Motif scaffolding. Structure first.
Motif, PDB file in Angstrom:
ATOM      1  N   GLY A   1     -71.291  34.840  19.259  1.00 49.41           N
ATOM      2  CA  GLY A   1     -71.191  34.546  17.841  1.00 49.41           C
ATOM      3  C   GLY A   1     -70.450  35.623  17.071  1.00 49.41           C
ATOM      4  N   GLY A   2     -70.221  35.350  15.793  1.00 46.60           N
ATOM      5  CA  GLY A   2     -69.508  36.225  14.872  1.00 46.60           C
ATOM      6  C   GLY A   2     -68.206  35.591  14.429  1.00 46.60           C
ATOM      7  N   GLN A   3     -67.167  35.753  15.252  1.00 51.53           N
ATOM      8  CA  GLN A   3     -65.827  35.215  15.023  1.00 51.53           C
ATOM      9  C   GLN A   3     -65.840  33.706  15.276  1.00 51.53           C
ATOM     10  OE1 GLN A   3     -62.085  34.203  14.398  1.00 51.53           O
ATOM     11  NE2 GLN A   3     -62.445  36.377  14.047  1.00 51.53           N
ATOM     12  N   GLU A   4     -65.251  32.942  14.348  1.00 55.20           N
ATOM     13  CA  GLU A   4     -65.110  31.488  14.459  1.00 55.20           C
ATOM     14  C   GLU A   4     -64.208  31.099  15.641  1.00 55.20           C
ATOM     15  OE1 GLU A   4     -63.005  29.819  10.977  1.00 55.20           O
ATOM     16  OE2 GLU A   4     -61.378  31.287  11.222  1.00 55.20           O
TER      17      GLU A   4
ATOM     18  N   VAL B   1     -70.441  27.594  13.942  1.00 59.44           N
ATOM     19  CA  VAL B   1     -71.113  27.161  12.716  1.00 59.44           C
ATOM     20  C   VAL B   1     -71.025  28.270  11.639  1.00 59.44           C
ATOM     21  CG1 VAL B   1     -73.333  26.265  11.745  1.00 59.44           C
ATOM     22  CG2 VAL B   1     -72.667  25.641  14.096  1.00 59.44           C
ATOM     23  N   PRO B   2     -70.215  28.118  10.555  1.00 57.77           N
ATOM     24  CA  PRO B   2     -70.191  29.160   9.509  1.00 57.77           C
ATOM     25  C   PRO B   2     -71.505  29.238   8.745  1.00 57.77           C
ATOM     26  CG  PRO B   2     -68.391  27.587   9.193  1.00 57.77           C
ATOM     27  CD  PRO B   2     -69.318  27.000  10.208  1.00 57.77           C
TER      28      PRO B   2
ATOM     29  N   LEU C   1     -79.909  36.952  10.311  1.00 59.04           N
ATOM     30  CA  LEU C   1     -80.464  35.803  11.030  1.00 59.04           C
ATOM     31  C   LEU C   1     -80.808  36.211  12.452  1.00 59.04           C
ATOM     32  CD1 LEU C   1     -78.013  32.905  10.033  1.00 59.04           C
ATOM     33  CD2 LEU C   1     -80.288  33.424   8.982  1.00 59.04           C
ATOM     34  N   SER C   2     -81.886  35.668  13.007  1.00 53.89           N
ATOM     35  CA  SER C   2     -82.278  35.952  14.388  1.00 53.89           C
ATOM     36  C   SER C   2     -82.080  34.663  15.178  1.00 53.89           C
ATOM     37  CB  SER C   2     -83.707  36.483  14.479  1.00 53.89           C
ATOM     38  OG  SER C   2     -84.098  36.598  15.836  1.00 53.89           O
ATOM     39  N   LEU C   3     -80.934  34.594  15.881  1.00 54.59           N
ATOM     40  CA  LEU C   3     -80.486  33.433  16.645  1.00 54.59           C
ATOM     41  C   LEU C   3     -79.920  33.833  17.995  1.00 54.59           C
ATOM     42  CD1 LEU C   3     -78.582  31.554  13.803  1.00 54.59           C
ATOM     43  CD2 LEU C   3     -80.792  30.872  14.789  1.00 54.59           C
TER      44      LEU C   3
ATOM     45  N   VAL D   1     -71.998  31.254  13.740  1.00 56.78           N
ATOM     46  CA  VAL D   1     -73.046  31.306  14.765  1.00 56.78           C
ATOM     47  C   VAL D   1     -72.732  30.238  15.804  1.00 56.78           C
ATOM     48  CG1 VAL D   1     -74.861  32.445  13.376  1.00 56.78           C
ATOM     49  CG2 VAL D   1     -74.738  29.923  13.430  1.00 56.78           C
ATOM     50  N   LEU D   2     -73.318  30.367  16.985  1.00 60.53           N
ATOM     51  CA  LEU D   2     -73.049  29.384  18.017  1.00 60.53           C
ATOM     52  C   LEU D   2     -73.948  28.165  17.819  1.00 60.53           C
ATOM     53  CD1 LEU D   2     -72.730  31.746  21.132  1.00 60.53           C
ATOM     54  CD2 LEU D   2     -70.844  30.883  19.754  1.00 60.53           C
ATOM     55  N   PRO D   3     -73.458  26.919  18.112  1.00 65.10           N
ATOM     56  CA  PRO D   3     -74.318  25.721  17.938  1.00 65.10           C
ATOM     57  C   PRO D   3     -75.600  25.790  18.764  1.00 65.10           C
ATOM     58  CG  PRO D   3     -72.054  25.098  18.432  1.00 65.10           C
ATOM     59  CD  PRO D   3     -72.133  26.557  18.669  1.00 65.10           C
ATOM     60  N   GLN D   4     -76.727  25.559  18.097  1.00 61.52           N
ATOM     61  CA  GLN D   4     -78.071  25.599  18.657  1.00 61.52           C
ATOM     62  C   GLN D   4     -79.038  24.895  17.729  1.00 61.52           C
ATOM     63  OE1 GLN D   4     -79.543  29.995  18.148  1.00 61.52           O
ATOM     64  NE2 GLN D   4     -77.345  30.015  18.015  1.00 61.52           N
ATOM     65  N   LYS D   5     -80.215  24.555  18.253  1.00 62.52           N
ATOM     66  CA  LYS D   5     -81.260  23.943  17.478  1.00 62.52           C
ATOM     67  C   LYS D   5     -82.105  25.013  16.791  1.00 62.52           C
ATOM     68  CE  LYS D   5     -84.517  20.417  16.805  1.00 62.52           C
ATOM     69  NZ  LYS D   5     -85.776  20.377  17.621  1.00 62.52           N
ATOM     70  N   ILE D   6     -82.318  24.829  15.481  1.00 65.13           N
ATOM     71  CA  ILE D   6     -83.232  25.654  14.679  1.00 65.13           C
ATOM     72  C   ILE D   6     -84.403  24.737  14.348  1.00 65.13           C
ATOM     73  CG2 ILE D   6     -83.621  26.945  12.535  1.00 65.13           C
ATOM     74  CD1 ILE D   6     -80.489  27.459  12.548  1.00 65.13           C
ATOM     75  N   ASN D   7     -85.622  25.143  14.685  1.00 64.60           N
ATOM     76  CA  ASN D   7     -86.824  24.341  14.400  1.00 64.60           C
ATOM     77  C   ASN D   7     -87.330  24.547  12.970  1.00 64.60           C
ATOM     78  OD1 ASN D   7     -86.981  23.495  17.237  1.00 64.60           O
ATOM     79  ND2 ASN D   7     -87.869  25.503  17.625  1.00 64.60           N
TER      80      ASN D   7
END
Ligand SMILES: [Cl-]
Ligand SMILES: [Cl-]
Ligand SMILES: [Zn+2]
Ligand SMILES: [Zn+2]
Ligand SMILES: [Zn+2]
Ligand SMILES: [Zn+2]
Ligand SMILES: [Zn+2]
Ligand SMILES: [Zn+2]
Ligand SMILES: [Zn+2]
Ligand SMILES: [Zn+2]
Ligand SMILES: [Zn+2]
Ligand SMILES: [Zn+2]
Ligand SMILES: [Zn+2]
Ligand SMILES: [Zn+2]
Ligand SMILES: [Zn+2]
Ligand SMILES: [Zn+2]
Ligand SMILES: [Zn+2]
Ligand SMILES: [Zn+2]
Ligand SMILES: [Zn+2]
Ligand SMILES: [Zn+2]
Lengths: 224, 232, 224, 232
Positions: free
Chosen positions: B88-91, B115-116, B135-137, B174-180
C-alpha cells in the motif's frame, strides 16, 4: 360452537429477514393476565376487556376484532414513553378462543454496551425527539405532529422495568438526537443511518468509544 | 504508421461514484509519466506519455482489433516479461484499450486497482488541521499482471499507515480488503490525545473504491441505529 | 475592483461517495449562454439575467446571491417534467466574476438497458407519482402536495433531448409506481428499496428480464 | 457423575435475525437424533439426544471449565478422529458449550453453518403453489471440524439446486458464498414457462444467514432504484 369466547395475546407476523419489536418484546409479555385492553368487533365502540379473565358473548361468517393496549381513556392525541399496541383478529362465530395478533405502534429504545449486552451503569442516556402525535383508533397508526418541538426523553435500562417507547418519526443520518451524561460530562450520540421509524421498528443506543474521532465510510463500485 | 496514447478513465454504472471521479487518471498519468504497455500476448515495454508514439507493428499476432494493457506506475524489468507482490501507499492503475491498427490515437481506459483514502471534516470538506490520522490495515498483497487485480495476503498482519491530507498532494492508497462493521481500524492523534475512528458498516473494498475518514464529535458516546421491518 | 460583474454557472459540492444529479448532468449543460435565470442579492426581488451576455452593477464585505433556473414567471406552486435548479454564491463587491453554485431541486429520471447503457427502443416507460408541489423561493426546496393524487408521467429517452424530472417525494420499497408498454403489453416496474428523494437525487429505471419471477434477498448476521 | 445435554441456539446481536429464529436448533436436533460431541483436544463420539448421558471423566485434560464441541448431523468415523469436504442440501449445525465438571446439564449453543432457503409469495407468506423454484449456486465446500465454518470451493462450478417449500418439511440449505447484485441465479418454472429470479443486492452469506426467494410480478419489466446523496 361456543356461546362465549376467550382472548389470547399473539403477535402480528414479522418480516422473515428482519427482527420486529414483537420479536424482541412479545405482546404476551406486555399483555399478561389481569391487563385491560379496549376491544371491539368491526363497527362497535371499544369496551374494556380483562385478559385471561373476561369472556364475551358471540352476539356473519367471519368477524373482525380490533384492540388497543393500554386501554383507551376517529383519532386521539398521544405522547411517547409508554408503549402502544394495536391488535386484530379474524374469527368465526362459535370459536372458543379468539387470537388477537398485536403490533407495537410505538418504537422501543434499548441501551446496549460495546459487546451488545444490555447496559447497566450509572450514565444517563437521553434522546431529543418529537414526543406528541396523533393515533388512528381504527388502524392503530401514530403520526407525529410536524409542528411539535423536539423534547428530551430519558431512556430506561432493563433493571428499571419499563421500556422507553418513542413515537414513529424520521431520524436523519448524522442527526445529533442523543446525549450521554456521566459525572456531569455530556457526549453526543447520533444516528449513523436514516431511520424512517414505523410500527414494528426498534431503536438501539450503542455505547462505546469506537467512533470517538469520527467514522470510516466508503463505496464499492463495479467497473464495466 | 504510429499511434499516440491518451489517458482516459474506465467506466462504471452512470449512477456509481468511482475514485476516477475524484482522482481522474489524467491527473496521475501526466505528460512525461512512464507506463508499461503491451499488446495481448506480448511483453510490457515502457511508454512516455504525451511524448512517445508506438509503431503499429508492435501488436503481436493480432489482426482486425488489438487489445492493449498498461500499468501505472511502470513495472520492474522482471515483471514486464503472471503475478507480483505489492504494498500500500502509492496508487496502482491498470488500463486497457481496443483499437484497430492504423488508428492515430489509442485511448487507454484506466481503472484504479488500489483504494484512495480521503480525510474530511464534519461537512465533507477536506480536513486541513494538524491532527495525525492513521489506519490499521493489511499492507501486503499480490497483483495479477494481466488484469491488474490486487488480492490481499489473508495471512498478513494489520499495519499502521499514516493518511495524507488533500493539501499534501499525494493520496494514501490502501490495498483492496474487507473492513468489518465496528472494526477499530482508525486513530486520530492531536496533542498527544488519541481517539478511535471505526467503520460503521462492512466495506468489501475493490478497484474503483474510495475510503473516507469523516472526523466529528457526533458519535463521542456511541451511535443510534435500529431496525425498520416491513410488513408485506 | 470591477464596476460590473459577470455570472458563471457552476455546481454545488457533491457527496464524495455518492453521485449527485449534478455529477450526471452539470448545471453548465442546462444553463448555457443565452439562457435566462432569476437572480437577486439577499433581500431583493428576483430579476431576469441572460447568462453569458448580461452584467450587473455592483450597487458590505460579502454579498450572497440567489438564482432560479428556469426563470420565475414567499412560495410558489410547481409541477414535474421540466427540471428546476437553485443556485447560491458568496462574493466580494468588486469581483469581475460571480460563480453561482447550482443544485437541482427536482429529480431526473434515466432509462437504462440490461447493460446500464442508455435505453433506445420503442417501449413506453411511465411512472405513477405525485406531480404537484410547492417550491420555497428563498432556498429552492420543493415539497410535494400530500393531498395530490398520483399521475402517470412518461419518461423520456436521451434522443428526445429533454430529461424527465420528478418532484421530490418518498418512494417505498416494492411500490409498483412504474409500467413498461411494448406492443400493447404492459409490465410492472417497482422500486427495490426505499427512496426518500430530495434535491440532488437521481432515479434510474433499469429494464431487464432478470427479476421476471421475483427477487432473491437475504440477511448476513454475525454470531457472538 | 453424569451430565445431560440440552439443545439451544447461539446468539447474535439483539436486533439481528438469525436462521435460528425461524428454524430453532431444538426443532432439528430432537429426541433420538445423534450428534458428534467432543471435549476440547479429544475425538468426536456419538451422543443420542434426549436419551444419553455422558460421564464427567470424558473431558480430556480440562480443569475448572470444560469446552464441548458438537456436529449435527453426526460425523463419519474418519472425521470424528482437521477439515472435511461438504455439499449443499442437508443443513449442518455446530454447537459449543462451556460447563463446570459436576453440572447436571450442559447446554449446547448451536450455530447453523449452512444457509436455509425459503420460498415466499408477494406478502412474505410461505409459497404453496406448484411452480418449480431452482437456484444455480456452488454446491461444494470444505468444513472446519474444530469451529464448524464452511468455505466454498472457488474453483467449483455453479449447479442447479431445487428449493423445497415449507410444507415439504425439509429446508433446502445452501453453502455460504457470495451472491452478486443482479446475478441471475434463480429460475421459476410453471407450466413449461421459465422466469428469472435474481439478487437485487450483494449477499456475502455466512453461518446464521437466510436466503429468501420472493415471487411476484412487481419487477416484470425491470426495477426502479436511485441515489439520494447527502449534502453534509
Ligand atoms: Cl463511471
Ligand atoms: Cl440471537
Ligand atoms: Zn405467534
Ligand atoms: Zn401513551
Ligand atoms: Zn456488535
Ligand atoms: Zn472498543
Ligand atoms: Zn455507506
Ligand atoms: Zn506500490
Ligand atoms: Zn508489512
Ligand atoms: Zn456536529
Ligand atoms: Zn446498520
Ligand atoms: Zn465545479
Ligand atoms: Zn416546472
Ligand atoms: Zn449494472
Ligand atoms: Zn439477463
Ligand atoms: Zn436487503
Ligand atoms: Zn451435508
Ligand atoms: Zn457438484
Ligand atoms: Zn403486486
Ligand atoms: Zn442499490
Amino acid at each position: 360452537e361456543a356461546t362465549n369466547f376467550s382472548i389470547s395475546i399473539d403477535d402480528a407476523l414479522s418480516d422473515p429477514l428482519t427482527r420486529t419489536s414483537n420479536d424482541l418484546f412479545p405482546a404476551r409479555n406486555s399483555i399478561t393476565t389481569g391487563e385491560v385492553i379496549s376491544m371491539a368487533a368491526s363497527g362497535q365502540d371499544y369496551t374494556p376487556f380483562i385478559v385471561g379473565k373476561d369472556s364475551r358473548a358471540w352476539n356473519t361468517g367471519t368477524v373482525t376484532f380490533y384492540a388497543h393496549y393500554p386501554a383507551l381513556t376517529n383519532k386521539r392525541y398521544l405522547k411517547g414513553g409508554q408503549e402502544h399496541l394495536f391488535g386484530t383478529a379474524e374469527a368465526a362465530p362459535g370459536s372458543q378462543n379468539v387470537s388477537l395478533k398485536f403490533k407495537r405502534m410505538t418504537v422501543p429504545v434499548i441501551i446496549l454496551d460495546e459487546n451488545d449486552r444490555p447496559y447497566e451503569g450509572e450514565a444517563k442516556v437521553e434522546l431529543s425527539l418529537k414526543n406528541e402525535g396523533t393515533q388512528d383508533l381504527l388502524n392503530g397508526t401514530i403520526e407525529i405532529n410536524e409542528n411539535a418541538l423536539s423534547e428530551n426523553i430519558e431512556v430506561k435500562k432493563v433493571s428499571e422495568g419499563v421500556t422507553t417507547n418513542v413515537l414513529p418519526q424520521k431520524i436523519n443520518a448524522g442527526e445529533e438526537i442523543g446525549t450521554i451524561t456521566v459525572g456531569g460530562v455530556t457526549q453526543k450520540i447520533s444516528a449513523v443511518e436514516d431511520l424512517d421509524l414505523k410500527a414494528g421498528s426498534t431503536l438501539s443506543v450503542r455505547l462505546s468509544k469506537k467512533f470517538g474521532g469520527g467514522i470510516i465510510d466508503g463505496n464499492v463500485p463495479l467497473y464495466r
